[PDB]
């Protein structure tokens, strides 16, 4: 049962790492999305402010 | 700049010398008829921020000023405006009738009723141009104010003249919070202490006609609306209109509280005020900022908030109280309104709509509210109970996510938090609140399951009232630590809880 | 970029909430331990 | 000449003056207004009307309003004589006591310390503060930035530190409520009355009152920077006394010049500030400090509104803050009181050549230990103290204890904090540090070290717990 | 009236100088105003020229008839300021007076071409262990310095200078070099400490003062890049190896930003305009060695990079990376984790190259860096620590030993060969039994033992620059005595 336990923990961590990479995938996707989003957002803000001038 | 009269509209009479007759002090032609952004031919001798009266009766608020052209405000839906129109500038800082004849009368900031209750019966017209209170005029104030909700009075004691700021977003019971305060402010205003009898102010900005009528049904049902001032800036409230509605409240508070009225103003939301002033500045083509919003909203909104003074002995002795309620964008603390209030407020309340999302109704954002006012305006009995209650609820939260003795502590704290809950539209006197506070400080039902306590709390309030309503009024009037009422409470607690099973 | 030490705890999400709660549980176990030891030491110093 | 109201949306006004535009820093009074309305000529636009910085409410003005041209910045008396009342930068004594007239009167626009003539040393201006001494001891007359937020203890820790030090200022002193609450104004007036370092009726005023309140618009609220610089120069020479200076708050102040820039049509910075808003603020930081005949133990509040740690405003703040006071509002959320950002604030008196090898080394080891605390905290969040290693569980307990021993409830705080203040001795602090390094309460609960003064006092508190258990 | 080489202030505000006249005046010249304000204009309007107030022009009222002196930016040249504290306006810095520098070099200095460049081979005096270890700076190198508030950036600089000033006070024929480093955007107290220590560290012996104060004029901040460029070129075309330190760099960026902003020039990203490439790289690309034809001098540059919350995507940083022949990543948490030096090593990088690398120190670093990466390769595993694979455990201990050696001492430059020797002892495995908490004091004590005794062998290796297996063994035995006897 102890070998079962150690192997189970290993495989569990494995599945966990799989799920982690998966989450991180879309996480980074939206992350760059929001990164560029805020970048260009401030950009457009400045652009309009220039337009205001 | 675009030569406004560089056209023969005035230039013809200029080269022909025919323009000389123009009323050039507080009247004239419209130097610019457009978008309600009003420039007036002449009237350069008009006061700044003065009143302008169109020949069509429409009111003008000349803020921007070319030499004779101006930026004035179309105080109305001007679908009939005409070129070169005549605005007889009234030349005055905006004022409108004031007096508690409005308290119990639903009129607008200019004294305009929408419900058909009659012309503004409020006595005298007050120019809202009110500055900050004086160091001699102002002093520390620590008198209690009507809170009426268990945790509300408990941790964020309500000070007579304290300026609240209650963080709670869209559909977070913010309106429900105001109604709860009013029901609490009812029994206080429904009291013979003219300090307690509050002819006070409460408003919800952007209260559409349906919202207005519903709120009116509620407030009249409360009958505290009789001793209350309630204006509802409906869906068409003008940017100048909604913009100075807080200034209307400022002038009204000077009127009553500066005459010693221990009274409260509830206006929200100044974020919508930002939208309105920004709409103006856009129409004004004025330099925009964050969210296009002006960065000078600081001092502009400070004109209302930063002048927070509870009428001291020099100011009549009442209270010019405020009760802001903040509404997060997405928890966007750094939102222009949000960051500003954070940058502005010295003390603020926060509601956890996530606990309301968790289902808690009410669901105040525990800890997230700030009461730098402290318990100095709560019952010293309530203050004593809260001294323990703070740590109790903290530990209940501190390890909420499950020692056995620590497990006992957590069970007691969770049950206490459950007990502190309140229903929907159920504000009352803090007497039963302090009663349950004594119950918890004794843990009078911490053995009763919170689900058992769910009804046991109601049964406890009931059996105490049927047992010590006299002792309730006793501890009330006495206020101080009533060891005799404390033992009576221990007995009636054995009665209510022990007799409940 | 870089990853902080306690970066999740720095973020302190539900994971960080668990961090806090488990700190509560384990530190409270150790606290009962230290308190019991102190009670024993007080008992010892009584004589 | 004499300017005349021409065309303006409010204070952004070029007033028609018969001659040209006065020299720079010109501040002229509006003749024909409700009150004495001094407006600062600021835009060399010419046209015999310079778009001028009016600090007052423009309402009621009629175009053509002929105003009194002065030609320079506001002149009011200074020196330790004006101490005792509360006066405006225009000199307006708002202490309801009329002009508290002093001797040294001059304009405010001036230069910074000389490239060879200032003070060139740093002396630890110790005050015995638990956390501050523990890690980041301050120094004499430097640019110490108080990185704290709104309602974030900045005024609370300010009250504690005022109670601590202000009663015993080296000479006279100054305090500015720059956009402080008017309620806070009256409360601070009552507090000064009850404080004695400045006495309202009595001439015990080792302090100077100043107000730049939030209900006061930026035109004044943004302008008191030069007033403070001049007051610091006076305490250097004219008031001529070893003076610490209080001024709060500057976030709304630099933001106030920012809001002004729009009327100036001045370029919005990253936070929309004036492009040279930084230029002034850095120059504002360069005016008056410790020098040969200069000395300003000025306390600078670094407001981080919206908790934006990397704020461009915080950027300029860190840019000249010779001393750093990094709050950890998260710590306060964790109940810390003190609650500073420990491994974040920088102070020169924390150095082996300065703090001594022992003290600086101890502080650095504390920083490392807390860093491990954070690191392993998430590690536990994964696993937990079930796997707590011998070095680790030990480290966990020790770090918890360090955090506990960090804070203390003050007597002014005892109003809310209940526990009155503990005058932390420096040697006591270092000794508690060494003992904790040894583990002075291994069998005991760290909660005693929490909100505590001396480590021995904490041992006593733990014994009291043993009683109460 | 004047319309050729003198203008008259048309309309101003915040020093926005656009005068009427001097239309025929040349472009980009620092000319005296009607208030005599020697200042430069760039925005030559069709009707006027946008002139930058070279500082504060409060002594200039509107309408002023500015006489276009036709004088371009010219700044002194020659090592007369080496050790002397001077300001870029011909003024002193610490009030250190006339450096005995007479000339002034017009702004007309261009960067060297490929032919005018020289191959870089100088191993830089870095005074920080890993600095020289992982990657020193070539003869005229170009490495970024990423850092944050009070990040020790100037402290790493002090280690370098202390390693540098010895030969700056010294004469080593290949080490003869010129030194100038900016304290840009510096508080008065900071600059005073800088001058005082330069005296104290004797760095005020051969260093030409560079700094921009917090009160330094934004135009002054802008010219400071050009100022340092000309100053370096002085000794660089004078065959003397020279050093620049754009410290800081972002401040002048915000400066020119505010400048063009007043000028109503287009902002660009973060209001930063293209000059972040154009003006900034205009000085940046010159970070090289003036050819033997160009004098044989080396133009080193040490720009300072503020990590605004690690603003890794700063358009400033953006240009920097595309320009960086090197960068200084700092694991500041490590200093916060006690490890000061807080080396962000796997993060750190340098593209200058190893043509200036001591093949002895190169040999040391070849294994040191591989071991460091391998430790870093599984350093996550160190967290659990337990059941460490023997290879993994040994790799960790080597990394653990290095972490013990990872720290650095403020204002504490040392012999580079000393670090080479320490790393060599590690390579011997001769440190495998030293407890890391004490292994640091160990290495220090062994260092003392050598610097007394093997100081002979130390100079032997140093002048040798060649690792004699016998000399290697002699140092090994000296160290073995020092350490076994530690």
Short mmCIF file of N, CA and C in Angstrom, two decimals, chain D residues 21-24 42-46 112-113 115-116 119-120 267-268 275-276 279 282-283 286 310 318-320 322 343 346 364 367-369 371, chain E residues 10-14 57-58 61-62 92-95 149-150 185 187-189 192 196 214-215 254 258 261-262 271 308-309 333 335-338:
data_model
loop_
_atom_site.label_atom_id
_atom_site.label_comp_id
_atom_site.label_asym_id
_atom_site.label_seq_id
_atom_site.Cartn_x
_atom_site.Cartn_y
_atom_site.Cartn_z
N UNK D 21 3.38 91.86 -19.60
CA UNK D 21 3.38 90.80 -18.60
C UNK D 21 4.54 90.96 -17.64
N UNK D 22 4.27 90.87 -16.34
CA UNK D 22 5.34 91.03 -15.35
C UNK D 22 6.35 89.91 -15.44
N UNK D 23 7.41 89.97 -14.64
CA UNK D 23 8.41 88.90 -14.65
C UNK D 23 7.83 87.60 -14.13
N UNK D 24 8.65 86.55 -14.19
CA UNK D 24 8.21 85.23 -13.78
C UNK D 24 7.84 85.22 -12.30
N UNK D 42 1.51 83.22 -15.08
CA UNK D 42 2.20 81.98 -15.37
C UNK D 42 2.39 81.68 -16.85
N UNK D 43 1.71 82.38 -17.75
CA UNK D 43 1.85 82.06 -19.16
C UNK D 43 2.34 83.30 -19.89
N UNK D 44 3.60 83.25 -20.33
CA UNK D 44 4.23 84.38 -21.00
C UNK D 44 3.67 84.44 -22.41
N UNK D 45 2.35 84.43 -22.51
CA UNK D 45 1.66 84.52 -23.77
C UNK D 45 1.72 85.92 -24.35
N UNK D 46 2.23 86.88 -23.59
CA UNK D 46 2.17 88.26 -24.02
C UNK D 46 0.74 88.77 -24.05
N UNK D 112 17.79 76.35 -5.22
CA UNK D 112 18.02 75.18 -4.39
C UNK D 112 19.34 75.30 -3.66
N UNK D 113 19.68 74.31 -2.83
CA UNK D 113 20.98 74.33 -2.15
C UNK D 113 22.13 74.36 -3.15
N UNK D 115 25.84 73.95 -5.03
CA UNK D 115 26.59 72.76 -5.42
C UNK D 115 27.79 72.52 -4.52
N UNK D 116 28.11 73.47 -3.64
CA UNK D 116 29.24 73.28 -2.72
C UNK D 116 28.94 73.70 -1.29
N UNK D 119 25.07 70.72 3.56
CA UNK D 119 25.60 69.76 4.51
C UNK D 119 25.90 68.44 3.80
N UNK D 120 26.98 67.79 4.24
CA UNK D 120 27.52 66.65 3.50
C UNK D 120 27.63 65.42 4.38
N UNK D 267 0.98 69.22 -21.23
CA UNK D 267 0.90 67.85 -21.73
C UNK D 267 0.60 66.90 -20.59
N UNK D 268 -0.38 66.00 -20.74
CA UNK D 268 -0.61 64.99 -19.70
C UNK D 268 0.55 64.02 -19.63
N UNK D 275 3.90 67.51 -17.87
CA UNK D 275 5.19 66.94 -18.23
C UNK D 275 6.31 67.41 -17.32
N UNK D 276 6.28 68.67 -16.91
CA UNK D 276 7.26 69.20 -15.97
C UNK D 276 6.75 69.18 -14.54
N UNK D 279 9.37 67.89 -13.05
CA UNK D 279 10.46 68.85 -12.95
C UNK D 279 10.32 69.69 -11.69
N UNK D 282 10.58 67.39 -8.31
CA UNK D 282 11.98 67.14 -7.99
C UNK D 282 12.69 68.39 -7.54
N UNK D 283 12.49 69.50 -8.26
CA UNK D 283 13.03 70.77 -7.80
C UNK D 283 12.45 71.17 -6.46
N UNK D 286 14.32 69.85 -3.85
CA UNK D 286 15.71 70.28 -3.78
C UNK D 286 15.92 71.58 -3.01
N UNK D 310 3.85 51.02 -8.04
CA UNK D 310 4.72 51.55 -9.09
C UNK D 310 4.18 52.82 -9.73
N UNK D 318 10.02 57.93 -5.24
CA UNK D 318 11.25 57.21 -5.01
C UNK D 318 12.43 57.94 -5.63
N UNK D 319 12.17 58.81 -6.60
CA UNK D 319 13.24 59.45 -7.35
C UNK D 319 14.15 60.31 -6.49
N UNK D 320 13.65 60.90 -5.41
CA UNK D 320 14.45 61.78 -4.58
C UNK D 320 14.36 61.43 -3.10
N UNK D 322 15.44 60.39 -0.14
CA UNK D 322 16.68 59.95 0.46
C UNK D 322 16.47 58.89 1.53
N UNK D 343 11.19 44.23 3.80
CA UNK D 343 12.32 44.06 2.90
C UNK D 343 12.30 45.08 1.78
N UNK D 346 14.22 51.48 2.30
CA UNK D 346 15.66 51.64 2.37
C UNK D 346 15.99 52.81 3.30
N UNK D 364 19.65 42.49 7.97
CA UNK D 364 19.70 41.76 6.71
C UNK D 364 19.30 40.30 6.89
N UNK D 367 15.69 40.19 7.10
CA UNK D 367 15.10 40.27 5.77
C UNK D 367 15.15 38.93 5.08
N UNK D 368 16.29 38.24 5.17
CA UNK D 368 16.41 36.92 4.57
C UNK D 368 15.42 35.94 5.20
N UNK D 369 15.29 36.00 6.52
CA UNK D 369 14.40 35.09 7.22
C UNK D 369 12.96 35.33 6.81
N UNK D 371 12.02 36.64 3.99
CA UNK D 371 11.91 36.20 2.61
C UNK D 371 11.66 34.70 2.55
N UNK E 10 8.49 86.07 -28.92
CA UNK E 10 7.14 86.30 -29.42
C UNK E 10 6.10 85.92 -28.38
N UNK E 11 6.01 84.64 -28.04
CA UNK E 11 5.05 84.17 -27.05
C UNK E 11 5.62 82.95 -26.36
N UNK E 12 5.56 82.97 -25.03
CA UNK E 12 6.26 81.99 -24.21
C UNK E 12 5.33 81.51 -23.11
N UNK E 13 5.91 80.77 -22.19
CA UNK E 13 5.21 80.23 -21.05
C UNK E 13 5.88 78.92 -20.73
N UNK E 14 6.22 78.71 -19.46
CA UNK E 14 7.02 77.55 -19.06
C UNK E 14 8.29 77.42 -19.89
N UNK E 57 14.50 80.40 -16.84
CA UNK E 57 14.70 81.74 -17.39
C UNK E 57 13.82 82.79 -16.72
N UNK E 58 13.60 82.70 -15.41
CA UNK E 58 12.74 83.67 -14.73
C UNK E 58 13.26 85.09 -14.90
N UNK E 61 11.63 88.22 -19.20
CA UNK E 61 10.24 88.58 -19.42
C UNK E 61 9.90 88.45 -20.90
N UNK E 62 8.60 88.47 -21.19
CA UNK E 62 8.15 88.28 -22.56
C UNK E 62 8.63 89.42 -23.45
N UNK E 92 31.48 73.89 -11.83
CA UNK E 92 31.95 72.81 -10.98
C UNK E 92 30.78 71.91 -10.57
N UNK E 93 31.10 70.77 -9.97
CA UNK E 93 30.05 69.86 -9.53
C UNK E 93 29.89 70.00 -8.03
N UNK E 94 30.90 69.55 -7.28
CA UNK E 94 30.91 69.73 -5.84
C UNK E 94 31.37 71.13 -5.46
N UNK E 95 31.33 72.06 -6.40
CA UNK E 95 32.07 73.29 -6.23
C UNK E 95 33.55 72.99 -6.20
N UNK E 149 14.70 50.95 -7.20
CA UNK E 149 14.99 51.92 -6.16
C UNK E 149 16.05 51.39 -5.20
N UNK E 150 17.10 52.18 -5.02
CA UNK E 150 18.19 51.89 -4.10
C UNK E 150 18.71 50.47 -4.29
N UNK E 185 19.89 62.57 -12.40
CA UNK E 185 18.71 62.58 -11.57
C UNK E 185 19.05 62.31 -10.12
N UNK E 187 19.86 63.28 -6.11
CA UNK E 187 19.58 64.17 -5.00
C UNK E 187 20.85 64.84 -4.51
N UNK E 188 20.71 66.05 -3.99
CA UNK E 188 21.87 66.79 -3.50
C UNK E 188 22.66 65.95 -2.50
N UNK E 189 21.97 65.31 -1.56
CA UNK E 189 22.65 64.45 -0.60
C UNK E 189 23.38 63.32 -1.30
N UNK E 192 26.49 64.66 -3.03
CA UNK E 192 27.50 65.00 -2.03
C UNK E 192 28.20 63.75 -1.52
N UNK E 196 32.14 62.95 -1.92
CA UNK E 196 32.87 62.68 -0.69
C UNK E 196 33.53 61.31 -0.74
N UNK E 214 18.77 66.29 -9.41
CA UNK E 214 17.32 66.37 -9.46
C UNK E 214 16.87 67.74 -9.94
N UNK E 215 17.65 68.78 -9.64
CA UNK E 215 17.32 70.11 -10.14
C UNK E 215 17.99 70.39 -11.48
N UNK E 254 12.39 61.00 -20.00
CA UNK E 254 11.23 61.77 -19.58
C UNK E 254 11.48 63.25 -19.80
N UNK E 258 9.08 65.66 -21.91
CA UNK E 258 8.45 66.91 -21.52
C UNK E 258 8.82 68.02 -22.48
N UNK E 261 6.93 67.67 -25.61
CA UNK E 261 5.55 67.84 -25.20
C UNK E 261 5.17 69.30 -25.17
N UNK E 262 5.95 70.11 -24.47
CA UNK E 262 5.81 71.55 -24.60
C UNK E 262 5.88 71.97 -26.06
N UNK E 271 4.26 58.56 -24.19
CA UNK E 271 4.74 59.88 -24.56
C UNK E 271 6.20 59.86 -24.96
N UNK E 308 11.17 49.66 -13.46
CA UNK E 308 9.97 50.22 -12.86
C UNK E 308 8.99 49.09 -12.64
N UNK E 309 9.00 48.53 -11.44
CA UNK E 309 8.30 47.29 -11.16
C UNK E 309 8.70 46.22 -12.17
N UNK E 333 15.22 40.34 -4.97
CA UNK E 333 14.67 39.53 -3.88
C UNK E 333 15.78 38.78 -3.16
N UNK E 335 18.82 39.87 -2.50
CA UNK E 335 19.27 40.81 -1.48
C UNK E 335 18.23 40.92 -0.37
N UNK E 336 16.96 41.04 -0.75
CA UNK E 336 15.87 40.93 0.20
C UNK E 336 15.85 39.57 0.89
N UNK E 337 16.27 38.52 0.20
CA UNK E 337 16.49 37.21 0.80
C UNK E 337 17.87 37.11 1.42
N UNK E 338 18.47 38.25 1.77
CA UNK E 338 19.79 38.31 2.33
C UNK E 338 20.90 38.22 1.32
#
